[PDB]
Amino acid sequence: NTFTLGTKSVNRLGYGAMQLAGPGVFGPPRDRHVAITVLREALALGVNHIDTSDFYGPHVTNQIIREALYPYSDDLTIVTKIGARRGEDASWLPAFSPAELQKAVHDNLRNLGLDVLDVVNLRVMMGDGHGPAEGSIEASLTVLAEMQQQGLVKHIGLSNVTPTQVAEARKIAEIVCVQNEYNIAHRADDAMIDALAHDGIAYVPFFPLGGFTPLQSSTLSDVAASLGATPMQVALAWLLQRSPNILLIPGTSSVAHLRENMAAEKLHLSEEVLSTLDGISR
Incomplete structure (x- = not known):
């Protein structure tokens, strides 16, 4: 269904551009033709929220979005994130000095072919670990x-x-x-989600299917099979019903997966099914 991000209405099923880049999100994608096709199919399928970054394989993913979709319709919101840069070892390095942040906003503008950025995420990196600190x-x-x-x-x-x-x-x-970070397993942010919800602030889970144990994954597949659905489709459908302020940005290099991701909006999750899924993290 929809949500108002900033001042633009977005479809809660959006598209994450992270796969449109080489492995480790570094360098060119396997097939730039397929990248272009996926972006175009996404918009044709009703996507109007695209999540990206200029430190995705640096610069290349933005330039592909531009080649594929420029000039962008009034409908499209492109969300980008700054605060990190790419070492040449494909590492993800903190880049939050004033010069770096300005440089990051500047590269985004040139590579996307824009004068102004709709939404810019500051990607925080406190401490040595890989999550919120x-x-x-x-x-x-x-x-x-x-x-x-x-x-x-x-x-x-x-x-x-x-x-x-x-x-x-x-x-x-x-x-x-x-x-x-948030999905059917990893629900530590549950309260924040609802709190943000109350204030009309969107919450955007990174990865619908990240980090499931064999048994957690097995429970999801059980549920997906009974519904004739894919586990990723169940994952997405659950995210959508969990809260009205949630926006999804699943990433893929594949038209089929894009198509099946988009079909998740139709997937009806029964209260009974909801009981099983709500218990996966417990």
Whole structure:
């Protein structure tokens, strides 16, 4: 169904561009023709929310979006994330100095062929681990808030953040979305989701199917099979019903998977089925 991200209405089934790049999201995709076809099919299928980044295989994924879809319809929101850069070892490195953040916003503009960015996520990276960790994001966000004032960024969002950091952030600028690790398993952000929901702020789970145990995965496949659905389709359908402020950005290099992802909007999840799925993380 739909949600208002910033000032643009988006279809809650969106498209994550992360697969349109070589392995490790690094360098060119296997087949740029297929990349182009997938983006175009996505819009044809009703996608109007595309999630991307200029540190995806750096620069290449943005340029493919541009080749494939420019000039973009009024309908399309392109969300990009800054705050990291790509080492030449394909590592993901913190890049949140004022110069780096400005450079990141600048590359996005040139590679997407835009004058202004609809939504820009600050991808927070506190500490040595690979998820949300506490630490002030004010310095980084302030730099973003200024590019918003200079008219280069329309709306500001957050990726990989604690509830505290979200609170901090909202004192500095308006936050239209939070993009975190979350799915049927990993539900630590449950309360934040509902809280954000109350304030009309979107929540954007990274990966519908990341990190399931054999048994968790096995329970999902059971459920999917009974419904004649794919586990990814059940994963997505569950995410959609879980909360009205949730926006999905599943990524794929494949038209078939794009098609079956989009079909998830039709997948009806019974209350009985919901009982089984709600118990997977417990």
